[PDB]
Amino acid sequence: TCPFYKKIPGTGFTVDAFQYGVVEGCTAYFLTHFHSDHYAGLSKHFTFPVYCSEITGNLLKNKLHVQEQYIHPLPLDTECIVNGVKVVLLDANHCPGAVMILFYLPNGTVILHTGDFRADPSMERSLLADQKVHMLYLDTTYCSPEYTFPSQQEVIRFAINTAFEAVTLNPHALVVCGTYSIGKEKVFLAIADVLGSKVGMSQEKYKTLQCLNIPEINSLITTDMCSSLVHLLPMMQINFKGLQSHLKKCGGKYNQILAFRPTGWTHSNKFTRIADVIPQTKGNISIYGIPYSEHSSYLEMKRFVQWLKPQKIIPTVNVGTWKSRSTMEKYFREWKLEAGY
């Protein structure tokens, strides 16, 4: 059965609720972004209206084969009316096509659902400026102060400098980047740009990137692996075994691999700064783990919520344990007492 935190009260609406069959009373199903935990249960044979961004709609149509008659794409930063209720989609600063949703209830209640987001001070000058919000449905992935990590800009700088140094020392090195979903495209695009190369990949991954409305994308990516010295592979292949196997298929064009594994937060972030990071190495193969997060850090989350001053917060992540729920509730109270709302 559909849990309470996926339902919007006073409406016929659900958010990211496709894995419970037909939800009784649901007139419109919203999808915040094309990540598998959120779209789980959507397939070719789904027959109810789906509301989403244009990019999410392209992926539904082309990758999951949902019929076009059930896909309702909406523009960003624009007042739209769905089943007689005013809604606005906002960029979530997550993966391509990811949105937050504002619902203006007939009775005057205002609800913000963040989907998955990486909070940023630029959101304080969106359409949210001076907007009363009664309920906030919040991406609480990293709601604890131990969760620290650098800016995306800092992480990209490290990656670009590392790749450029390695290939300048050895022009016959190949660069490989792991992927298992959309998001984090800046990692491989920034590296390929500094190296003067297109990014090479499978037909399936090419299809996925062609749905994302990235400007000038045809100039940046290719299925011709032989023409490229930055390759994408599944994240599961980024290990010494999988990279040794990949190198053997490249026809003696390369004699070294430098590989990147984009992660979220990991335990090493407690101890070792991005500037000090080193790779794991075996022979002519090196692997860097880089913490490129598309979720709020604890401090980013805290600033956004203290600025917004919501009357009630409903977490949407880490909801399944009493320990997690208690910890989150204690921080929300702390934040409220500190800021005076």
Binding site for ligand AWG (CB under 6 A): 169-171, 256
Residue 35 contact partner, candidates Ni ion, ligand AWG, none, CB within 5 to 8 A by sort of partner: Ni ion
- Residue with Cβ nearer ligand AWG (114 or 197): 197
Nearest approach, Cβ of 180 to Ni ion (angstroms)? 12
By C-beta, is 227 or 255 nearer to ligand AWG? 255
- 300 by Cβ neighbours in 10 Å (0-12 / 13-18 / 19+) ranks as buried
Alpha helix segments (H runs only) across 215-341:
240-248, 298-308, 322-339
Q: Which is nearer to ligand AWG, 108 or 283 (CB)?
A: 283
Phi-psi region of 81 (alpha: psi -120 to 50; beta: other; left: phi over 0): beta
DSSP 193: H
Decide which of Ni ion, ligand AWG, none touches 294; Cβ closer than 5 to 8 Å per partner kind.
none
Q: Which is nearer to ligand AWG, 113 or 246 (CB)?
A: 246
The interface partner of residue 256, options being ligand AWG, Ni ion, none and the CB cut-off 5 to 8 Å by kind, is ligand AWG
Torsion region of 90: left, alpha or beta (phi above 0 gives left; psi -120 to 50 gives alpha): beta
Task: Please tell me the number of Cα atoms within 13 Å of 43 on its side-chain side.
Answer: 4
CB of 269 to Ni ion, least distance (A): 19
Cα distances (angstroms) measured from residue 299 to each of 100, 140, 146, 275? 19, 12, 10, 21
Residue 326's CB: how many other CB atoms inside 10 A? 9
User: What's the closest the beta carbon of residue 44 comes to ligand AWG, in angstroms?
Assistant: 48
Name the token pair of 100: 């937050």
> Among residue numbers 23 through 62, which ones bind Ni ion (CB under 5 A)?
35
Other CB atoms closer than 10 Å to residue 144's CB: what's the count? 13
Nearer to Ni ion by Cβ, of 113 and 198: the residue is 113
Which of ligand AWG, Ni ion, none binds 169 (CB below 5-8 Å, type-dependent)? ligand AWG
Q: Which of 16, 116, 185, 300 binds Ni ion (CB under 5 A)?
A: 116
Binding-site partner at residue 116 among ligand AWG, Ni ion, none, CB < 5 to 8 Å by type:
Ni ion
Under the criterion CB under 5 A, does residue 118 sit at the interface with Ni ion? no
Contacts of 280 (CB under 8 A, 6+ apart): 286, 287
Question: Which one, 116 or 185, has the nearer CB to Ni ion?
Answer: 116
Q: What is the closest distance, in whole angstroms, from the C-beta atom of residue 170 to ligand AWG in the complex?
A: 4
Phi, psi of 284 (to 5 degrees): -90, 20
**Contact residues: Ni ion, CB under 5 A:** 35, 116
